[PDB]
């Protein structure tokens, strides 16, 4: 199947500064028919289930602040936070839903410096 | 890793009738410390990513109509739809997020019996 790997497992940045989380798929998740990457990013604050943040690799889900943005294609993707805020402290997960079983990466813990 | 299996892979019922999709986990996702199940249900329509429908096994997400309700505990869960409506036609997936890697079931196609 498709294995997803993230990097790092955790990281910290000062409030106000940028942060980037990387994710690699063991296989391509690009659907050529409509040239789209079936990749998503989830935000998980402790005490809550994972919440959809970004899909199609770069499309933010409604409600998500414009400071979150996704990029990448094929097998390498990145989640970018332009200005870390207190509420952004959480564990992020990338996921591919190109072929079943849909799979997640191991997760990356984001914290404040 | 925990393995999620659903039954059946596809099914159909008449509009206004009930439908049930089952999901098994190879290992319990019941969390003893809080006695809650780390189980979720998603609805996926064509051209869109799966969308969170239910979490904690029975908590309905915001905006989700009461026709949808989840049940089960440990390793056996069930998604129920009391009155099938045309917009409920989609593929449903269960997910465990008790222990990484979080995982999905193979998906169940819900169709309208004409």
Q: Which of A37, A25, A49 is CA-nearest to residue A105?
A: A25
Q: How many domains does chain A fold into?
A: 1
Instruction: Closest CB to A52: pick one of B52, B101, B105.
Output: B52
The whole-angstrom distance between residue A6's C-alpha and the CA centroid of its chain comes to: 9
Q: Which residues contact A95 (CB under 8 A, 6 or more apart)?
A: A4, A39, A40, A41, A42, A102, A103, A104, A105
Q: How far apart are CA B70 and CA B52, in angstroms?
A: 13
Contact B106 A107 (CB under 8 A): no
Q: How far apart are CA B56 and CA B28, in angstroms?
A: 13
Q: What share of chain A is helix, strand, coil (3-state, %, to 5)?
A: 5, 50, 45
Instruction: Closest CB to B100: pick one of A51, A52, A107.
Output: A107
Q: Which domain holds residue A61?
A: 1-113
* Domain harbouring A51, CATH code: 2.60.40.10
CB contact A104 to B (< 8 Å):
yes
Residues from chain B contacting residue A56 (CB–CB below 8 Å): 49
Q: How far is A77 from chain B (nearest CA, A)?
A: 17
Contact B104 A101 (CB under 8 A): yes
Largest CA distance in chain B: 47
Q: Entry resolution in angstroms?
A: 2.3
| CA distances (Å), origin A108, targets A22, B7, B60 | 9, 32, 27
CB contact A100 to B (< 8 Å):
yes
Q: Which residues contact B15 (CB under 8 A, 6 or more apart)?
A: B84, B85, B86, B112
Q: Which of B111, B112, B113, B104 is CA-nearest to residue B6?
A: B104
Q: To 5 degrees, how large is the angle CA B66–CA B69–CA B73?
A: 155
CB contact B82 to A (< 8 Å):
no
Tell me phi and psi for residue A35, to 5 degrees: 45, 50
């Amino acid at each position: 199947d498709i294995v997803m790997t993230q990097s790092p497992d955790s990281l910290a940045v000062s409030l106000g500064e940028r942060a980037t989380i990387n994710c690699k798929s063991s296989q391509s998740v690009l659907y050529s028919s409509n040239s789209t990457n079936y990749l998503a990013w989830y935000q998980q604050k402790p005490g809550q289930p994972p919440k959809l943040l970004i899909y199609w690799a770069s499309t933010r889900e409604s409600g998500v602040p414009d400071r979150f943005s996704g990029s990448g294609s094929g097998t390498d993707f990145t989640l970018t936070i332009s200005s870390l805020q207190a509420e952004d402290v959480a564990v992020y997960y990338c996921q591919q839903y190109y072929s079943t079983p849909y799979s997640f990466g191991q997760g990356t813990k984001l914290e404040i410096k």
